[PDB]
Amino acid sequence: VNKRMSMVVSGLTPEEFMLVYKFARKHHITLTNLITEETTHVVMKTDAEFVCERTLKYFLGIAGGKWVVSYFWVTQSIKERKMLNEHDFEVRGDVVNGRNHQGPKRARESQDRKIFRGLEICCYGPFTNMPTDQLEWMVQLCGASVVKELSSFTLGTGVHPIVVVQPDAWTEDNGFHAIGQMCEAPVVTREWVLDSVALYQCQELDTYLIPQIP
């Protein structure tokens, strides 16, 4: 069948979005507020060097191997009144993981070798600023298998379980340290997932590990 251009925007003011809306309207490009499997283009606010902030749409964009391109793609296409090529405007990095890590490009090219493949991940709440099912969708897009309960982890030397938590979300008790007594798997911060996705390369769990009381 025909999968058609379909955009979402991120990090744009309500104003800048209007320009995109006009752009989408002129060229009859589908524009939506919510990102989906169908979405092909994620238009990010960036600087002159195509570096951008890390938003939910940014992560999901890369994870889905979609076109993650700069807002300049839209404005420049307007200034030339033509549909410019995405390749020229693909974001090269973000503020956090490097300004040219080429995460988006690698994500487009590694859809047969997903980073989280062969892993089972449980997103152990609570979290903030990012719905748990969105985080779960993010890993799922990256080949990881999602697990709801710590007791739902699949056993076997061939399956690797990972528990992901956000320490800042917990309150005044090192509860997150007590998880290890519930099941044996590595407990890592949400940053591990976010860094891995942004670069679209599976980071070593070392720097993200959380001390589990015996």
Binding site: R54, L56, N129, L194
Partner: peptide, 7 residues
């Protein structure tokens, strides 16, 4: 607005 959070 209620602009999207950043990580």
């Amino acid at each position: 607005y209620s602009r999207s959070p950043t990580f």
